[PDB]
């Protein structure tokens, strides 16, 4: 519960600065939280489905790798 509100405004600030964003409006943060949430929804749904067919109650890094390759947002680094 409420770890969606565990997203801090200075973290959003830091992401904007590495993102290169200078000026920050105030109506941004919860919109950011909602987009991040829907993203992670689709991600973990697919990863857990890959683990559903895996017949193992633990999800691996490889699972999340394969699932994000399925979305085409494909990330290297951890093998897969």
């Amino acid at each position: 519960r409420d770890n969606i509100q565990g997203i801090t405004k200075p973290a959003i600030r830091r992401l904007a600065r590495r993102g290169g964003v200078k000026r920050i409006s105030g109506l941004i943060y919860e919109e950011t939280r909602g987009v991040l949430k829907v993203f992670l929804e689709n991600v973990i749904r697919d990863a857990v489905t890959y683990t559903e067919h895996a017949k193992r109650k633990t999800v691996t890094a490889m699972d999340v790798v394969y699932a994000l390759k399925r979305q085409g947002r494909t990330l290297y680094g951890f093998g897969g």
Binding site: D46, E52, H53, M62, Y66, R70
Partner: protein, 95 residues
């Protein structure tokens, strides 16, 4: 004369089931054939990845189920899984 393929008569019958009083154009029938092609191809590719991320080479219906609910969005997918599962029961219950 080389014999070419179509799926026109099958989905044609299905259309006649769901709408008896309805015509169709030929190009759209080809479009639906391409539609079946595309969906089948994405499913089969997910099946091959199911194989290689499971290190197995047998294909059963369980892999098809998990492939469909990997590809298709939720509510539509669960209805389709229901249709397929009831068909599995009706077929394999008999011969």
């Amino acid at each position: 004369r080389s014999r070419k393929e179509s799926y026109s008569i099958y989905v044609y019958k299905v259309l006649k089931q769901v709408h008896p009083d309805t015509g169709i154009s030929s190009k759209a029938m080809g479009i639906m054939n391409s539609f079946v092609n595309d969906i089948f191809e994405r499913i089969a590719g997910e099946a091959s990845r199911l194989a290689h991320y499971n290190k197995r080479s047998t294909i059963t219906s369980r892999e098809i189920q998990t492939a469909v609910r990997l590809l298709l969005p939720g509510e539509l997918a669960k209805h389709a899984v229901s249709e397929g599962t009831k068909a599995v029961t009706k077929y394999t219950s008999a011969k």
